[PDB]
Design an enzyme around this catalytic site. Sequence first.
Site, mmCIF file in Angstrom:
data_model
loop_
_atom_site.group_PDB
_atom_site.id
_atom_site.type_symbol
_atom_site.label_atom_id
_atom_site.label_comp_id
_atom_site.label_asym_id
_atom_site.label_seq_id
_atom_site.Cartn_x
_atom_site.Cartn_y
_atom_site.Cartn_z
ATOM 1 N N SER A 1 0.773 -1.286 0.131
ATOM 2 C CA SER A 1 -0.092 0.050 0.064
ATOM 3 C C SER A 1 0.745 1.216 0.064
ATOM 4 C CB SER A 1 -0.762 0.122 1.320
ATOM 5 O OG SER A 1 -0.526 0.225 2.441
ATOM 6 N N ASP B 1 1.457 0.580 8.173
ATOM 7 C CA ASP B 1 2.825 0.340 8.094
ATOM 8 C C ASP B 1 3.535 0.540 6.687
ATOM 9 O OD1 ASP B 1 2.391 -1.733 6.385
ATOM 10 O OD2 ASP B 1 2.983 -3.528 7.857
ATOM 11 N N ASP C 1 6.109 -1.463 4.156
ATOM 12 C CA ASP C 1 6.547 -2.797 3.694
ATOM 13 C C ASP C 1 7.865 -2.268 3.059
ATOM 14 O OD1 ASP C 1 4.133 -4.725 4.902
ATOM 15 O OD2 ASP C 1 3.292 -3.220 3.538
ATOM 16 N N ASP D 1 8.015 -2.976 8.351
ATOM 17 C CA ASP D 1 7.945 -4.567 8.201
ATOM 18 C C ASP D 1 9.144 -4.656 7.294
ATOM 19 O OD1 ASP D 1 6.056 -6.066 9.561
ATOM 20 O OD2 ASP D 1 4.612 -6.350 7.922
ATOM 21 N N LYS E 1 -11.139 1.102 -1.857
ATOM 22 C CA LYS E 1 -11.008 0.658 -0.645
ATOM 23 C C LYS E 1 -11.558 0.994 0.355
ATOM 24 C CE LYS E 1 -6.517 -0.716 0.505
ATOM 25 N NZ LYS E 1 -5.063 -0.509 0.614
ATOM 26 N N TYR F 1 -13.978 -6.082 3.521
ATOM 27 C CA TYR F 1 -12.668 -6.046 3.179
ATOM 28 C C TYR F 1 -11.862 -6.590 4.275
ATOM 29 C CZ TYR F 1 -8.051 -3.346 2.542
ATOM 30 O OH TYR F 1 -6.711 -3.052 2.474
HETATM 31 N N1 LIG Z 1 4.894 -9.078 7.311
HETATM 32 C C1 LIG Z 1 4.247 -9.403 6.096
HETATM 33 N N2 LIG Z 1 4.801 -10.772 5.920
HETATM 34 C C2 LIG Z 1 4.394 -11.247 4.781
HETATM 35 N N3 LIG Z 1 3.941 -10.544 3.677
HETATM 36 C C3 LIG Z 1 3.590 -9.207 4.031
HETATM 37 C C4 LIG Z 1 3.812 -8.499 5.193
HETATM 38 N N4 LIG Z 1 3.382 -7.435 4.976
HETATM 39 C C5 LIG Z 1 2.817 -7.304 3.873
HETATM 40 N N5 LIG Z 1 3.010 -8.532 3.111
HETATM 41 C C6 LIG Z 1 2.391 -8.721 1.932
HETATM 42 O O1 LIG Z 1 2.357 -7.482 0.986
HETATM 43 C C7 LIG Z 1 1.066 -7.395 0.547
HETATM 44 C C8 LIG Z 1 0.955 -5.995 0.647
HETATM 45 O O2 LIG Z 1 0.926 -5.293 1.738
HETATM 46 P P1 LIG Z 1 -0.015 -4.382 2.434
HETATM 47 O O3 LIG Z 1 -1.310 -4.792 2.085
HETATM 48 O O4 LIG Z 1 0.432 -2.998 2.161
HETATM 49 O O5 LIG Z 1 -0.263 -4.558 3.903
HETATM 50 P P2 LIG Z 1 -1.206 -4.772 4.946
HETATM 51 O O6 LIG Z 1 -1.101 -6.027 5.855
HETATM 52 O O7 LIG Z 1 -2.491 -4.416 4.439
HETATM 53 O O8 LIG Z 1 -1.151 -3.538 6.188
HETATM 54 P P3 LIG Z 1 -0.773 -3.370 7.717
HETATM 55 O O9 LIG Z 1 0.460 -4.418 7.937
HETATM 56 O O10 LIG Z 1 -2.052 -3.611 8.396
HETATM 57 O O11 LIG Z 1 -0.105 -2.082 7.821
HETATM 58 C C9 LIG Z 1 0.211 -8.127 1.522
HETATM 59 C C10 LIG Z 1 1.075 -9.316 1.788
HETATM 60 O O12 LIG Z 1 0.803 -10.445 0.618
HETATM 61 MN MN LIG Z 2 3.392 -5.618 6.832
HETATM 62 MN MN LIG Z 3 1.378 -2.674 4.751
#
Ligand SMILES: Nc1ncnc2c1ncn2[C@@H]1O[C@H](COP(=O)(O)OP(=O)(O)OP(=O)(O)O)C[C@H]1O
Ligand SMILES: [Mn+2]
Ligand SMILES: [Mn+2]
Length: 470
Positions: free
Chosen positions: A84, A95, A97, A149, A210, A219
């Site tokens: 995101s 967060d 990523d 992350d 969204k 969602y």
């Molecule tokens: N900690 C993680 N471990 C593994 N895959 C992850 C992790 N964080 C994100 N991803 C992967 O990246 C994809 C897109 O991430 P994103 O949609 O931005 O995170 P999110 O979990 O929606 O946000 P939040 O973690 O709630 O802040 C979702 C997942 O397949």
């Molecule tokens: Mn994450």
């Molecule tokens: Mn995220």
Amino acid sequence: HYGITSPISLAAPKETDCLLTQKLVETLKPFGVFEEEEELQRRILILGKLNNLVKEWIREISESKNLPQSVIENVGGKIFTFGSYRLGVHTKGADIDALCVAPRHVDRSDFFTSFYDKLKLQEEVKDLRAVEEAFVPVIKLCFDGIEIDILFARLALQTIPEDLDLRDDSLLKNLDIRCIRSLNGCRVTDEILHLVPNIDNFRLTLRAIKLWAKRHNIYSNILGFLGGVSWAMLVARTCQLYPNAIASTLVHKFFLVFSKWEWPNPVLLKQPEECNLNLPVWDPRVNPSDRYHLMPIITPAYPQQNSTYNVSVSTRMVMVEEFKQGLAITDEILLSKAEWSKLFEAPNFFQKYKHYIVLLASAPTEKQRLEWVGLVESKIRILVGSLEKNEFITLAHVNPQSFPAPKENPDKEEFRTMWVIGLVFKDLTYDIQSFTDTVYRQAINSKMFEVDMKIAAMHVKRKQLHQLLP
Ligand SMILES: Nc1ncnc2c1ncn2[C@@H]1O[C@H](COP(=O)(O)OP(=O)(O)OP(=O)(O)O)C[C@H]1O
Ligand SMILES: [Mn+2]
Ligand SMILES: [Mn+2]
């Protein structure tokens, strides 16, 4: 053009649409879907610091390995954001990523040892925790107030060039599965960004979709609905079909296209190519198991996967109906018979169904409540699944958003959460008791159960749902 089919229309917007799009933007601001510029700047600065730390760490590793001072000067290494935040639709509280990409002489064990310790001594870092044994190894932390992350991947390169493009399939060549898995997120996001004709138009549309999805209780990837990535791929497909349209039109077309989509026909953003590697690849032609998927939305990077294989008859049925209602509202808006505010109205879930099931989870401490609730949420589809096998059930709609449950013991403080599940009919004590027993049993066999962690569920008519929640 972009996409596996010709677009539906190449028409550009009219001044009429331009004004409708500006109104959409004004309606969205109060919801907080746009992060404040000052916060965006803070995040940029945080990323710069992390990137320099990664570079510093890799240099140190390179030196400690007596590598020729030749390479040491150009080993490079950097942080790649995905998800995101990278798409630019993250909201306040989300967060960041990130993927740390290092040259081959840097091992995974180093990431979890020397890099981890480097982060540990930074003044801006709090709540540093490592999860080395997860499907996708990660280091989690709070950096100057922002949750981060960080994933890791060591590519078969002596140096990491600044213009390195992670979409190149050759990069996956005989790498450990942990590295391959850690690279998928960045590859999917980058593919999506290169698969839409206009990034800005795509972004605004996704912010809208969204918010609409969350407000309409659909969602959640974990509960069988759609997650962030899946919604982004649906929006992207819409954008490919109307390359010159702006947000107001794209939001409307989004409902037109998907409310009429012929499931289980798959949503693809590009033509999949065959690659020699032996990685799981979604493909009904060669895998009979994939033929059962009900609402396939395929990730574009090899190895392509069905991002929505958790969808069941109930959730699909719920979302189809929501797309239809969404289309109706946008038709009105285009005729100036309604405002954008009507599309983002969160109907009373506690009144749309005649029957409901209330799920209660509690623990002795707030810390245990958090762990328990996560475990229970991951099992809820088991109940939905059994409910779908019930001859009297048409569907079960789990409201993804749980909340603090009423008190039971007025003498002591309680840590209890609850979910409300809507039902539609064509005694449920046996199915509910069966699900309850299963959650306790699996949790216990998994060594993830603490004494006094409870879970209970009840069936109740809409009228009596009243007397069971604040
Ligand atoms: N900690 C993680 N471990 C593994 N895959 C992850 C992790 N964080 C994100 N991803 C992967 O990246 C994809 C897109 O991430 P994103 O949609 O931005 O995170 P999110 O979990 O929606 O946000 P939040 O973690 O709630 O802040 C979702 C997942 O397949
Ligand atoms: Mn994450
Ligand atoms: Mn995220």
